[PDB]
Write a protein that holds these residues in place. Structure first.
Motif, PDB file in Angstrom:
ATOM      1  N   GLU A 192       0.819  -1.208   0.000  1.00 54.22           N
ATOM      2  CA  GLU A 192       0.000   0.000   0.000  1.00 54.22           C
ATOM      3  C   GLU A 192       0.854   1.261   0.000  1.00 54.22           C
ATOM      4  O   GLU A 192       0.437   2.290  -0.546  1.00 54.22           O
ATOM      5  CB  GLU A 192      -0.944  -0.006   1.202  1.00 54.22           C
ATOM      6  N   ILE A 193       2.043   1.208   0.603  1.00 51.03           N
ATOM      7  CA  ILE A 193       2.934   2.362   0.591  1.00 51.03           C
ATOM      8  C   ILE A 193       3.585   2.526  -0.779  1.00 51.03           C
ATOM      9  O   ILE A 193       3.656   3.638  -1.314  1.00 51.03           O
ATOM     10  CB  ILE A 193       3.984   2.232   1.710  1.00 51.03           C
ATOM     11  N   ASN A 222       2.367   1.635  -3.538  1.00 49.79           N
ATOM     12  CA  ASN A 222       1.353   2.068  -4.491  1.00 49.79           C
ATOM     13  C   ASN A 222       1.291   3.585  -4.621  1.00 49.79           C
ATOM     14  O   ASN A 222       0.766   4.090  -5.619  1.00 49.79           O
ATOM     15  CB  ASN A 222      -0.018   1.525  -4.087  1.00 49.79           C
ATOM     16  N   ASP A 223       1.813   4.320  -3.639  1.00 53.86           N
ATOM     17  CA  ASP A 223       1.857   5.772  -3.641  1.00 53.86           C
ATOM     18  C   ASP A 223       3.317   6.227  -3.746  1.00 53.86           C
ATOM     19  O   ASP A 223       4.154   5.502  -4.313  1.00 53.86           O
ATOM     20  CB  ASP A 223       1.137   6.291  -2.399  1.00 53.86           C
ATOM     21  N   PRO A 234       8.479   8.738   0.323  1.00 54.75           N
ATOM     22  CA  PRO A 234       9.339   9.717   1.003  1.00 54.75           C
ATOM     23  C   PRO A 234      10.406   9.048   1.857  1.00 54.75           C
ATOM     24  O   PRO A 234      10.463   7.816   1.937  1.00 54.75           O
ATOM     25  CB  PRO A 234       8.353  10.522   1.861  1.00 54.75           C
ATOM     26  N   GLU A 245      10.807   9.153   5.225  1.00 52.39           N
ATOM     27  CA  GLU A 245      10.230   8.503   6.399  1.00 52.39           C
ATOM     28  C   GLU A 245       9.518   7.211   6.019  1.00 52.39           C
ATOM     29  O   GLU A 245       9.635   6.199   6.720  1.00 52.39           O
ATOM     30  CB  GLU A 245       9.268   9.458   7.108  1.00 52.39           C
ATOM     31  N   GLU A 246       8.781   7.224   4.905  1.00 56.82           N
ATOM     32  CA  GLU A 246       8.104   6.011   4.456  1.00 56.82           C
ATOM     33  C   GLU A 246       9.107   4.941   4.047  1.00 56.82           C
ATOM     34  O   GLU A 246       8.890   3.752   4.305  1.00 56.82           O
ATOM     35  CB  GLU A 246       7.157   6.331   3.301  1.00 56.82           C
ATOM     36  N   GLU A 298      12.165   4.584   5.304  1.00 59.17           N
ATOM     37  CA  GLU A 298      12.732   4.061   6.543  1.00 59.17           C
ATOM     38  C   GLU A 298      11.761   3.108   7.232  1.00 59.17           C
ATOM     39  O   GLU A 298      12.165   2.053   7.737  1.00 59.17           O
ATOM     40  CB  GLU A 298      13.108   5.212   7.476  1.00 59.17           C
TER      41      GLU A 298
END
Lengths: 168, 244, 761, 137, 77
Positions: free
Chosen positions: E2-3, E5-6, E9, E11-12, E14
């Motif tokens: 799901e991450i 799919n977008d 960044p 933080e994401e 890491e």
């Protein structure tokens, strides 16, 4: 000359203000004029008591300049005029008419530290009318679960009666 | 049993009556819309106004313990599942236990007055010294090095630890210059470090010294102090099992 | 308390009438003493005190009252004796010892007993600035024996809690009095003073002590002098920032002149020794000076001086110069990291602020930057800026702009990624602030770009999950980053009214988005206090005794903010929150985040339904309790938007069913809704179905199913292209442009075969 | 009672209705008194801001649910008075007909108290219909 | 998924790396518990072959290849 009648809610800052009722006179006629020509007749005794409390209370925003209804033992036998309960609870005796009105209103208020031992007399002796009113309230079921007060009152009454010469 | 609801108007308890009145005022303020302070302070002031003293002090203690800067949880399950709040509450409980021991020492001082075998003197260190002189002024067997004004240094340190007066402990350490060994710097570091950081090698050496020598002296206060410093075992009892 | 002579007389007579016993009158003497003291009868008050003692001697209250009366009168010896008697009777109240120490300090007695009493009172009460100053003066008049105890008490207080600004100032003054520059430096080198360096007098004393230490050590070259000079310049910059934030102009001008003089003096440090870190230090000083000049210029513009554009152009040029200042790179030498970390943080904050201000001033036109560069970057522009700032004073060679003839500056536009990195680096040291977040949100709303509030909240707040949580609890698990972002967006939308009005009513050109040092309460004091209480509760640093009131206030205001009990908010803010949540859920592909956003939107619609029912009854929305929103009953909705809100709720429920799993229900809902968004959702559903069919093996039946799905998707894309050709609002209504639509249409056509062309069923 | 209801209302629904609603229903059906708690009645007047009404809203729906529970249990005169206080002519006439239907089958001579009860209920209903809007056609 | 799919960044990224490391450790301890007592083979509704394949895929996506944590041709150490 105007200071006697209308009297809006008291509001003081820090200057020299002296209005409301009577302006430092006798509390009896003060409350009389307050009930007569201050609040409209549509108001109630509770509203009048709340207005008088906000008048002689220090929580209005500055310094009060009215008078407090003192318990009358002979000719005005209390402690000072115009004192909020926060400054009265130290040692100053509270009123009896206010307590009676509050008891008639609701019995959900504090009664452990209230009720002065003086039975409308300068001396704390003679618990006649006080014991009568307390027995009437206990029969009508309006006091609280506190047998220590009744015990000490009965002991003091028995002591006074055996001192004056009564047995039955 | 309890204060059940009497049929209609009758006679209830003053505590329950005042609490119901305060709840009524709280509901009135809620209906008005202004932000309410806290019902805990209202209950505390009601208990202080009432003639009852024991339950009043109990509620005062409960309020002072709950007024810790902790995040309000949702349920007991969440509270017991969260680990940080548990150790935070444990640390706060230890701090409040130290404060309660200090308050008990103050109450004992007030009971002993001033002119009674060296009464209480203003100041934390002076109050601890007065409490020590009231409890045991005679030199306890098992003394090492010197003393501060003829008073047991080990018992003084133990009383300071139990009271939680770290500034008084620092003052005692500074006063005990030649009346102690070479552990004054270790004591100062242990007092100044909230997380107890006084070198791991020094801590291990102190633990070894306690396990070797300090295991049978006639000074329970000194033994407990050395055990607390060296961090040995989990429970060390000497003479505290006596309704205390 | 209205009291006079006759008033006290009648009070006394009423108290006499309230007592019919001589011993009762004597017992009531504790009030008679006060009455006589008010009526100016000291002998009568003393007689009443003696009479009350004769019937109830040895009591702390009476002794404390007598001591207070003696202290107010002037009998210091009698007050000390009474307090000593009360202490030897029962030392329960330390106020007696406190007053004894106060009297001793006021009388100035140099004795060991007085020193011991002062030390005991200090051990009792470590606070109170009055008694602190008293004991400090006493132990300074004493000598070194008292100074040792004062230093021990100061160390104990510092270990117990962070000391005070005045306490540290007095300690440094006592150090300088006996000349202990080494000890002063060792005490000031602790990092616990970065939050206490907010006192002008304390910072000036630190600067003076550092200058004295440098003058005394003039002969050794080490990194200690460099880091001391760096800390001195940081304290000077903090003083200038405090003067700019304060409501004074003369103090701000004096601080700016002092900073300019410090920069002129430090200009020689680059050519002196150890120029490695000193170059970055000089760059940071230049950037800070430009920031202070721009802040003072904007303050003068707000106070109204001359032309708004003629005051914006020099400020914009100063911001551009601060942005073009070289960023802090690597350090060739070490030893000054303590003095370089805060400098780098301040430089990143200045870069972020300058970029944001330049973007807000340029709006959408990028030629204004080049115009300002070609216009106000000349010697005449610098002279005009100096005459506007310092009112034509000092000299030209006091700053770098006057030392070096700067005529043309290279053009540079701040990048979005660079600005985001600078903002993150600034927030990492700022720890987050409500006013700063509101200013950032307003700037991003003016720039018309989605602000990256998620990273900012994750950096300045503890990381919490963004899944399905509650909304009626003050626990950080319920107080989610999404709810915090919604609250910040609401605050920004409420504050946008002041930016839209006032400025445009005065002139079509006005400096939008005021900086941090000159920012006032644009939102509401109630919301500010609520956010402060929430931050205190989430950081676990409130005062013991007030945390209960704070959490109760938070729990009371949460039900009114998030609409949980009885409230009265406006429908416009609720509709805006619902639309923003739906847009974020449609943009993000995270399942849990989309589900949480959809649940929040459903709750908002359910809470708005009674407001819609009340509006339908021809009744306006009343004013909400507690001032928190700038919109009132004048911003109410009409009856024509009811159908639009119903269609929005229907499409929201359709998206909810789609993200849940009710495929047929979502399909029939999108078919019933005549929205282009619904048509695009149906097209995306058909496309993902065709993709998940093609992902597997296609023997024969699956191949025919894929062909049918491709034909359906081709027909839907043809109808979408026809609708887009009819009205070119498709690219504006959907976040995806027509390029991807044409690409997927060509892909579907190629997968179907070479038997059809574009716009074919 | 209100102090305890202030805490009981904090709980949400649990397996139909609510514990707070069940408790207040049990208390009102055990007390049978509402001239000062819910509102006084001259003969067919409206409702008055009672003690619980001065703190909680939805008083009309609460009174309607309480009267419905009382009717389902087995109360007639008190439920009729409660509905007359809450001003509901439809429900008043419905309960009147429901209570007078089974008595029609038996005798109607003055032999007990059911006839007097139905007579006073009919009088209250007719005076409520005369003073105010009645029920449906 | 799901991450990815977008956007991705810092933080994401890491958080995704931390989640992948946690998943690798979880698969390692799953293999350890399976090799411990045979009751896991009965109480596990998913065979160990799919678990080992998923662990190998996660390791290949992470980029590691040593035998110090989740080896290549064996599950345990």
């Amino acid at each position: 000359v105007f200071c006697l009648l209308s009297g809006t809610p008291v509001w003081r800052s820090s200057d020299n203000r002296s209005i409301n009722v009577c302006s430092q006179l006798d509390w009896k006629r003060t409350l009389g004029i307050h009930l007569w020509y201050m609040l409209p007749p549509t108001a109630t005794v509770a509203q009048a008591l709340h207005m008088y409390e906000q008048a002689f209370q220090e929580q209005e925003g500055g310094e009060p300049y009215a008078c407090y209804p003192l318990p009358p033992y002979l000719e005005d036998c209390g402690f000072s005029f115009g004192d909020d309960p926060s400054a009265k609870f130290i040692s100053l005796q509270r009123d009896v008419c206010v307590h009676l009105l509050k008891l008639y209103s609701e019995r959900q208020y504090d009664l452990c530290q209230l009720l002065d031992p003086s039975s409308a007399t300068p001396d704390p002796l003679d618990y006649r009318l006080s014991w009568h009113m307390w027995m009437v309230l206990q029969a009508l079921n309006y006091t609280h679960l506190s047998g220590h007060r009744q015990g000490m009152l009965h002991a003091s009454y028995a002591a006074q009666l055996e001192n004056v010469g009564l047995w039955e | 049993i309890s204060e059940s609801g009497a049929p209609g108007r009758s006679s209830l308890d003053n505590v329950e009556m005042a609490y119901a009145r305060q709840m009524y005022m709280y509901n009135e303020k809620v209906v008005s819309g202004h932000l309410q302070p806290s019902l805990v302070d209202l209950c505390t002031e009601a208990a202080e106004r009432l003639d009852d003293k024991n339950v009043s002090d109990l509620w005062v203690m409960v309020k002072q313990m709950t007024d810790v800067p902790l995040i309000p949880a949702s349920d007991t399950l969440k509270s017991r599942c969260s680990g940080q709040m548990q150790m935070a509450f444990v640390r706060q409980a230890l701090n409040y236990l130290e404060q309660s021991y200090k308050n008990y020492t103050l109450i004992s001082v007030f009971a002993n007055l001033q002119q009674a075998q060296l009464g209480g003197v203003p100041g934390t260190y002076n109050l601890v010294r007065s409490f020590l002189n009231i409890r045991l002024p005679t030199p306890i067997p098992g003394l090492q090095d010197g003393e501060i004004e003829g008073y047991p240094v080990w018992a003084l340190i133990y009383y300071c630890m139990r009271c939680g007066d770290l500034m008084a402990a620092q003052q005692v350490v500074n006063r005990a210059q030649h009346q102690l060994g070479d552990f004054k710097n270790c004591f100062q570091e242990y007092i100044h470090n909230k997380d107890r950081r006084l070198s791991p090698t020094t801590e291990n050496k102190l633990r070894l010294h306690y396990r070797r020598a300090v295991r049978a002296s006639t000074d329970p206060y000194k033994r407990a102090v050395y055990c607390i410093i060296g961090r040995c075992d989990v429970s060390d009892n000497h003479s505290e099992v006596a309704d205390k | 308390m209205r009291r006079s002579k006759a008033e006290i007389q009648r009070y006394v007579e009423n108290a006499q009438n309230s007592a019919s016993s001589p011993r009762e009158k004597s017992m009531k003497g504790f009030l008679f003493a006060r009455l006589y003291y008010e009526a100016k009868e000291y002998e009568l008050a003393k007689r009443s005190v003696s009479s009350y003692i004769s019937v109830q001697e040895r009591d702390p209250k009476a002794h404390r009252f007598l001591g207070q009366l003696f202290e107010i009168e002037g009998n210091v010896e009698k007050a000390v004796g009474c307090y000593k008697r009360s202490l030897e009777l029962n030392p329960t109240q330390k106020d007696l010892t406190l007053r004894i120490a106060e009297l001793i300090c006021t009388l100035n007695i140099k004795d060991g007993r007085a020193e011991y009493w002062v030390e005991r009172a200090s051990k009792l009460f470590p606070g109170s600035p009055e008694i602190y100053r008293l004991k400090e003066q006493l132990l300074s008049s004493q000598g070194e024996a008292g100074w040792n105890q004062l230093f021990d008490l100061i160390q104990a207080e510092l270990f117990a809690r962070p000391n005070d600004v005045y306490v540290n100032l007095k300690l440094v003054d006592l150090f300088l009095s006996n000349q202990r520059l080494e000890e002063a430096v060792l005490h000031c080198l602790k990092p616990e003073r970065r939050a206490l360096r907010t006192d002008i007098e304390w910072c000036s004393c630190v600067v003076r002590v550092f200058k004295e230490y440098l003058a005394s050590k003039q002969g050794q070259k080490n990194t200690n002098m460099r880091m001391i000079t760096k800390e001195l310049l940081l304290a000077q910059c903090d003083v200038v920032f405090l003067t700019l934030s304060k409501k004074d102009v003369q103090k701000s001008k004096e601080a700016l002149e002092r900073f300019d003089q410090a920069l002129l003096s430090v200009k020689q440090s680059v050519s002196g020794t150890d120029a490695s870190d000193l170059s970055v230090t000089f760059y940071e000083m230049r950037g800070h000076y430009y920031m202070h000049a721009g802040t003072l210029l904007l303050k003068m513009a707000q106070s109204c001086e001359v032309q708004w554009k003629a005051l914006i152009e020099p400020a914009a040029l100063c911001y551009l110069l601060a942005y073009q200042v070289p960023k802090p790179k690597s350090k060739p030498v070490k030893g000054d990291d303590n003095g370089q970390g805060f400098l780098e943080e301040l430089a990143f904050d200045r870069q972020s602020k300058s970029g944001h201000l330049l973007l807000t001033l340029s709006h959408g036109k990028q030629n204004f930057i080049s115009e300002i560069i070609e216009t106000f970057a000349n010697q005449c522009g610098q002279s005009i800026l100096l005459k506007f700032l310092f009112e034509d004073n000092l000299s030209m060679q006091d700053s770098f702009m006057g030392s070096d003839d700067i005529s043309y500056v290279e053009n540079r536009v701040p990048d979005l990624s660079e600005l985001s990195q600078h903002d993150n680096g600034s927030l990492r040291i700022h720890n987050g602030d409500l006013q700063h977040l509101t200013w950032l949100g307003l700037q991003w709303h003016f720039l018309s770009t989605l602000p990256p509030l998620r990273k900012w909240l994750k950096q300045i707040f503890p990381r919490v999950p963004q899944e399905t949580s509650r909304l009626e609890s003050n626990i950080p698990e319920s107080i989610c980053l999404l709810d915090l972002e919604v609250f910040l967006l609401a605050v920004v939308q409420t504050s946008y009214l002041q930016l839209q009005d006032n400025n445009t009513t005065a002139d079509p050109n006005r400096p939008r988005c005021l900086p941090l040092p000159i920012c006032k309460q644009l939102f509401t004091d109630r919301q500010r206090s609520w956010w402060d209480a929430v931050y205190s509760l989430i950081t676990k640093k409130a005062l013991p005794g007030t945390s209960a009131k704070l959490r109760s206030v938070i729990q009371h205001d949460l039900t009114t903010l998030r609409a949980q009990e009885k409230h009265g908010l406006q429908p416009a803010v609720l509709v805006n929150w619902a639309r923003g949540l739906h847009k974020t859920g449609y943009s993000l592909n995270s399942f849990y985040d989309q589900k949480e956003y959809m649940g929040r939107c459903v709750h908002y619609w359910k809470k708005l339904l009674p407001l819609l029912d009340l509006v339908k009854q021809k009744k306006s929305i009343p004013e909400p309790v507690d001032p928190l929103f700038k919109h009132f009953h004048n911003k109410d909705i009409k009856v024509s938007e009811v159908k639009d809100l119903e269609d929005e709720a229907c499409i929201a429920f359709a998206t909810l069913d789609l993200v849940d799993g009710k495929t047929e229900d979502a399909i029939i809902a999108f078919e019933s809704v005549k929205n282009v968004v619904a048509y695009w959702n149906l097209a995306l559903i058909y496309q993902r179905k065709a993709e998940e069919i093609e992902n597997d093996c296609l023997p024969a039946e699956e191949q025919e199913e894929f062909q049918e799905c491709l034909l359906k998707c081709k027909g839907f894309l043809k109808m979408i292209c026809d609708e887009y050709s009819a009205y070119p609002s498709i690219a504006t209504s959907l976040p995806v442009p027509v390029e991807t639509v044409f690409e997927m249409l060509d892909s579907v056509k190629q997968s179907l075969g070479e038997a059809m062309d574009d716009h074919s069923p | 009672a209100l102090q305890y209801f202030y805490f009981l209302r904090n709980e949400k629904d649990n397996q139909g209705e609510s514990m707070f609603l069940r408790c207040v229903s049990e208390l009102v059906i055990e007390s049978r008194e509402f001239d000062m708690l819910l509102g006084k009645l001259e003969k067919d007047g409206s409702r008055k801001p009672g003690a619980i009404d001065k703190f909680t809203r939805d008083t009309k729906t609460i009174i309607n649910k309480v009267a419905s529970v009382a009717e389902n249990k087995g109360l007639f005169e008190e439920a009729a008075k409660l509905y007359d206080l809450a001003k509901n002519p439809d429900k008043v006439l419905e309960l009147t007909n429901k209570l007078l239907s089974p008595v029609v089958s038996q005798i109607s001579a003055p032999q007990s108290n059911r006839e007097r009860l139905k007579n006073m209920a009919l009088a209250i209903a007719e005076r409520y219909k005369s003073q105010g809007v009645s029920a449906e056609k | 998924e799901e991450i990815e799919n977008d956007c991705l960044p810092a933080e994401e990224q890491e958080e995704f790396q931390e989640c992948l490391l946690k998943c690798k450790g979880f698969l390692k301890m799953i293999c350890d518990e399976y090799s411990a007592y045979p009751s896991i083979a009965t109480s596990l509704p998913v065979p160990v072959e799919t678990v080992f394949e998923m662990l190998d895929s996660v390791k290949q996506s992470l980029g590691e290849a040593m035998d110090d944590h989740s080896p290549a041709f064996m599950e345990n150490h």
